[PDB]
Amino acid sequence: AIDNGALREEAKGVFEAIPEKMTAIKQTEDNPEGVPLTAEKIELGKVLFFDPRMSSSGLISCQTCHNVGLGGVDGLPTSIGHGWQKGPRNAPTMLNAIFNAAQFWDGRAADLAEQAKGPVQAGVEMSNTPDQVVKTINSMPEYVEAFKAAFPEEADPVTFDNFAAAIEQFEATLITPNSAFDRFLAGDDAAMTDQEKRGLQAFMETGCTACHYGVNFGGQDYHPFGLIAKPGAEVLPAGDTGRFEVTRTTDDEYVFRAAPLRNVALTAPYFHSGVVWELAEAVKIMSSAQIGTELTDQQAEDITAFLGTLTGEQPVIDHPILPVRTGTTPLPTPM
Amino acid sequence: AIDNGALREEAKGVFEAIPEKMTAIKQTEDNPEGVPLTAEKIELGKVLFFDPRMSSSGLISCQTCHNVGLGGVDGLPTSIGHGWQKGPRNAPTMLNAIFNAAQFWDGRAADLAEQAKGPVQAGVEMSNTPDQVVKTINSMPEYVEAFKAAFPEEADPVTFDNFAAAIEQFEATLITPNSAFDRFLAGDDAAMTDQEKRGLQAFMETGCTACHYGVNFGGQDYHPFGLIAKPGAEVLPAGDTGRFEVTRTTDDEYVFRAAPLRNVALTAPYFHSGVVWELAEAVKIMSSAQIGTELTDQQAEDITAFLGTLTGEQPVIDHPILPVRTGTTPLPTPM
């Protein structure tokens, strides 16, 4: 009941593979070469991503909530940050985030550099200020040396904007090539089991591809959560109106960015609300809410199996050795 | 001033270099062969050390408080754990902890496997139970497979004792060879500056080696903090009586394990109380309190420079890719 060639041909018309490596970002028709990724900026960004002294507590880094061992997420319903404060939304992965059209569940940041300024300043996340970050960095000569070399022409290289640019460069390399689906797409019939291929068939036939398409199986545009039927009160909490918070436009109530499904098997729990632990349940909810069809248990299990083939090679990251604090480095303030 | 040969001979009589590698642990007079380290147990212990699902919150791992990029510590006055609860003591490094005679500031744990059971269960740390840890592990087939292979001679390999043994095996590899001091000791006269050698000389001549000796420059036995003169109430809080809590022997009032000084330049703030940020001030406090000698600014700076030569090669650790949770994995309970 499986036609590999047919399945592959349909899939190539709507999805594409994650690239093997990244060398530039922000390529447009207007600026075709884009912004080069540099070894110095990637390395600086890695150090900063793992440095919990970028938070006011001294205890929270990006890695705290975007754990590179847990698919780039924290595995909690919603994140817990400074002072144990609980946030409103589930932490999405930074893996492959570079390919999404906008960042956050409501698309309120245009790119990774704009995004990175948010957690630093948010009271429920790192609860810090831009000038505190700069003063912290400037207190450690190895960090200053790195910024001066990474941003070589600038009179003022150690800036919050450049902190964000370095993090963006590092995150642009956090991609996950060679998932079983990408290997099947490239020609290996044996890369996926029959059940996983039945799931791929069902995902394409049911209409999931209207919102989950391209390189990231999502992440490109915005849709009501409940296009055809509302999900429950716990899954769609009434107080989080999604895109409406950004656009203040009537049609945008409970409109969210389509989740990019790469590595979804690693990033439970699901949806922006984080109350659905079972991926098969998220699949059933999506069919009911977005398409108005009830999936059979077999179709939901098949689709869930298929979604597992979107797990790519996870980055192997040696934890950086952080610069040592000096006498005027700001003291941690967890309390 | 400095005669390298006499200095080296003196130092060799009281200290030892960190070994290049480890292949066995718990080598004692009774059992000189010890216990072999195995690749399978080391790897399993690495995964466990970085897995925040070993805490009840789902957010706190060993690495949270013993950050491999910060010299194996959190860099806070005292640690902050489950629920943002602040603990009574500064977190010591796990680097080279394998060489210490006992673990914790009061020596209450005999070895690293016994130690590891403590943070798992402490309310202010990981706030979990042994049964939940075992059930969490058993819910993930990759973990079960690893335990069965790491402990092949056992019918019940997935136990809390074996969790602790695997962590111990991993931590035994977290040693820091080839510090400048060790390189000097091995015959490189040029490995240390003149000032560092003056510091070494002063460290030996002032009396510090009565308590800070052997491979780890401490960690081997217990002494009053205030042998000669009491330190201030902030440095020695009245409510933490140290070893007395363990033995209930009144001779042990305010008695602590001599701190092992390896990597001390990386692990501010200092003492069990974590209120002294400046290493040179800790050096002055130790001279006044333990010896009854007031160091000059120059002697304190020289000794502090020498202590910097105890920083070894920091482990370069690839962050592990953690097993994926399944349907019956216990849910995180941060709230």
Ligand code: HEC
């Ligand atoms: C937990 C307390 C967090 C910390 C610390 C950091 N992030 Fe995070 N991140 C968190 C949440 C809850 C969210 C979703 C918020 C929303 O309103 O949508 C995010 C989002 C991101 C993203 C967007 C990815 C996407 O939408 O697909 C990125 C790229 C990201 N976070 C990166 C990032 C960086 C670089 C951090 C250190 C400066 C950082 N985050 C910290 C939770 C938490």
Ligand code: HEC
């Ligand atoms: C647009 C009209 C959609 C269609 C058709 C499908 N999905 Fe979707 N999906 C969409 C959005 C806007 C979101 C985010 C909703 C939110 O606010 O949380 C999602 C999310 C998912 C998820 C969760 C992924 C996560 O990281 O949490 C899954 C597993 C998912 N979608 C799967 C899925 C399936 C299998 C579909 C066809 C049956 C389907 N979606 C259709 C938008 C749209």
Ligand code: HEC
């Ligand atoms: C912060 C909330 C912690 C977590 C999580 C873990 N540890 Fe820790 N550790 C912490 C403190 C405050 C202390 C000192 C407590 C005392 O009473 O002395 C320690 C101690 C250790 C040690 C002893 C090292 C020494 O005394 O030189 C080791 C080896 C150690 N901790 C390891 C360890 C492991 C393996 C953990 C995960 C299971 C773990 N700790 C978590 C703070 C915190």
Ligand code: HEC
């Ligand atoms: C035994 C009587 C000691 C003598 C002599 C010296 N030290 Fe010591 N040192 C001792 C103990 C019991 C402790 C732990 C005290 C506590 O409760 O915190 C220490 C600690 C240090 C430290 C702090 C290291 C840390 O990781 O926090 C330093 C820097 C230190 N000791 C240095 C030092 C110097 C330079 C000494 C000679 C002048 C000296 N110590 C003597 C026990 C004893």
Ligand SMILES: [Ca+2]
């Ligand atoms: Ca999620």
Ligand SMILES: [Ca+2]
């Ligand atoms: Ca310390």
